[PDB]
Write a protein that holds these residues in place. Structure first.
Motif, PDB file in Angstrom:
ATOM      1  N   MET A   1       0.827  -1.267   0.000  1.00  0.00           N
ATOM      2  CA  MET A   1       0.000   0.000   0.000  1.00  0.00           C
ATOM      3  C   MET A   1       0.831   1.272   0.000  1.00  0.00           C
ATOM      4  N   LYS A   2       1.355   1.530  -1.177  1.00  0.00           N
ATOM      5  CA  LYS A   2       2.316   2.598  -1.429  1.00  0.00           C
ATOM      6  C   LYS A   2       1.657   3.813  -2.034  1.00  0.00           C
ATOM      7  N   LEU A   3       1.852   4.925  -1.368  1.00  0.00           N
ATOM      8  CA  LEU A   3       1.223   6.167  -1.770  1.00  0.00           C
ATOM      9  C   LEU A   3       2.254   7.188  -2.218  1.00  0.00           C
ATOM     10  N   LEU A   4       1.891   7.898  -3.267  1.00  0.00           N
ATOM     11  CA  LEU A   4       2.683   9.033  -3.765  1.00  0.00           C
ATOM     12  C   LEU A   4       1.904  10.316  -3.650  1.00  0.00           C
ATOM     13  N   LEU A  29       5.365   8.373  -0.195  1.00  0.00           N
ATOM     14  CA  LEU A  29       6.422   9.043  -0.945  1.00  0.00           C
ATOM     15  C   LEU A  29       5.917  10.401  -1.398  1.00  0.00           C
ATOM     16  N   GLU A  30       6.806  11.373  -1.327  1.00  0.00           N
ATOM     17  CA  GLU A  30       6.488  12.750  -1.706  1.00  0.00           C
ATOM     18  C   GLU A  30       7.189  13.206  -2.958  1.00  0.00           C
ATOM     19  N   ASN A  44       8.851   3.248 -10.089  1.00  0.00           N
ATOM     20  CA  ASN A  44       8.138   2.425  -9.087  1.00  0.00           C
ATOM     21  C   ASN A  44       6.668   2.177  -9.443  1.00  0.00           C
ATOM     22  N   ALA A  45       6.493   1.238 -10.352  1.00  0.00           N
ATOM     23  CA  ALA A  45       5.176   0.876 -10.904  1.00  0.00           C
ATOM     24  C   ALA A  45       4.255   0.219  -9.883  1.00  0.00           C
ATOM     25  N   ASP A  46       4.846  -0.105  -8.743  1.00  0.00           N
ATOM     26  CA  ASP A  46       4.129  -0.743  -7.616  1.00  0.00           C
ATOM     27  C   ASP A  46       3.348   0.252  -6.767  1.00  0.00           C
ATOM     28  N   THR A  47       3.527   1.525  -7.067  1.00  0.00           N
ATOM     29  CA  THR A  47       2.787   2.566  -6.364  1.00  0.00           C
ATOM     30  C   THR A  47       1.309   2.262  -6.554  1.00  0.00           C
ATOM     31  N   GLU A  76      -5.442   1.726 -13.928  1.00  0.00           N
ATOM     32  CA  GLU A  76      -6.407   1.512 -12.830  1.00  0.00           C
ATOM     33  C   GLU A  76      -5.942   2.049 -11.484  1.00  0.00           C
ATOM     34  N   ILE A  77      -4.880   2.835 -11.525  1.00  0.00           N
ATOM     35  CA  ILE A  77      -4.340   3.434 -10.309  1.00  0.00           C
ATOM     36  C   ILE A  77      -5.359   4.444  -9.817  1.00  0.00           C
ATOM     37  N   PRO A  78      -5.766   4.325  -8.544  1.00  0.00           N
ATOM     38  CA  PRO A  78      -6.587   5.358  -7.966  1.00  0.00           C
ATOM     39  C   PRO A  78      -5.788   6.646  -7.894  1.00  0.00           C
TER      40      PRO A  78
END
Ligand code: BEF
Ligand code: MG
Ligand code: MG
Length: 123
Positions: A1-4, A29-30, A44-47, A76-78
């Motif tokens: 559960m990786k957030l940018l 991540l900022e 980082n496509a896993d974001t 499909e990335i939120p």
């Protein structure tokens, strides 16, 4: 559960980040601008989730979102947009571009927590 989390405002990044923490979201991540955001996504496509401002130098959030949606890794990335651009015309613009959730600044840290809890729940 990786957030940018992307925003040219340093204090805004603080608050968002603190607020994610309170909701149990720690892998954050900022980025300051769109270019840096894009770079980080690309590497980082896993974001899992993109949270982006609109108005910023070095590629605005709108251009970022379109770019992201055009990539076949991030179809499909939120994508949550958090912005002062509160007018519906801009909202429509953003949804058409592929934004999924729209939060309008300004907010208290409490309101942000509610509005994010709505989208993200706890983690
Ligand atoms: F600079 Be942002 F669109 F709040
Ligand atoms: Mg900005
Ligand atoms: Mg603000």
């Amino acid at each position: 559960m990786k957030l940018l989390v992307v925003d040219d405002s340093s204090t805004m990044r603080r608050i968002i980040k603190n607020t994610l923490s309170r909701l149990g979201y720690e892998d954050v991540l900022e980025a300051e601008h769109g270019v840096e955001a894009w770079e980080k996504l690309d590497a980082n496509a896993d974001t899992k989730v993109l949270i982006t401002d609109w108005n910023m130098p070095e590629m605005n959030g709108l251009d970022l979102v379109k770019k992201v949606r055009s990539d076949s890794r991030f179809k499909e990335i939120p994508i949550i947009m958090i912005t002062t651009e509160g007018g519906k015309a801009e909202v429509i613009t953003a949804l058409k571009a592929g934004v999924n959730n729209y939060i309008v600044k300004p907010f208290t840290p409490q309101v942000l927590k509610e509005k994010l809890e709505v989208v993200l729940g706890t983690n």
